[PDB]
Amino acid sequence: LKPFERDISTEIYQAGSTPCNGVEGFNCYFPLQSYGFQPTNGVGYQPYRV
Amino acid sequence: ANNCTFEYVSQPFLMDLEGKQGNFKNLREFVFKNIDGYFKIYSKHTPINLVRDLPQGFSALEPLVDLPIGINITRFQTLLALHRSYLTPGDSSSGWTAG
């Protein structure tokens, strides 16, 4: 990344050389990931405000 | 649609266009770049005398505006606005006779 820039994308990042139309395939994983912060989790996975 | 977050508007509104075809006596310069994501635009204006070519001399440029755009930049296009009266049969997208 170029410092202080916002990546606004929806297209699926090509892993394993897979042209995907937002779809799955041979190791074609979703470009986004959502933190699974289960409430009252462990310290190493507790959420922090930064 | 808008889908936008940033705004910077100053409106000391005043009208002066003076549609003319005479020799150019008003010249503007704008220089655009970015460092660390801070987009910097430097601005200047000066009067000249030549009519057709570029007046070759020496001048200065000073910064005017800075923004925290934080966005990938690859392309740019300028903006132009011209529409004629009922006289021109060619519509706005079609015809114009004041270039």
Ligand SMILES: *[C@@H]1O[C@H](CO)[C@@H](O[C@@H]2O[C@H](CO)[C@@H](O)[C@H](O)[C@H]2NC(C)=O)[C@H](O)[C@H]1NC(C)=O
């Ligand atoms: C900004 O946009 C440009 C597109 O103009 C991106 O350039 C592409 O980068 C990928 C990286 O894998 C290349 O595969 C493409 O071929 C590039 N496109 C062109 C037209 O050269 C660039 O990656 C974007 N991001 C940054 C930080 O510059």
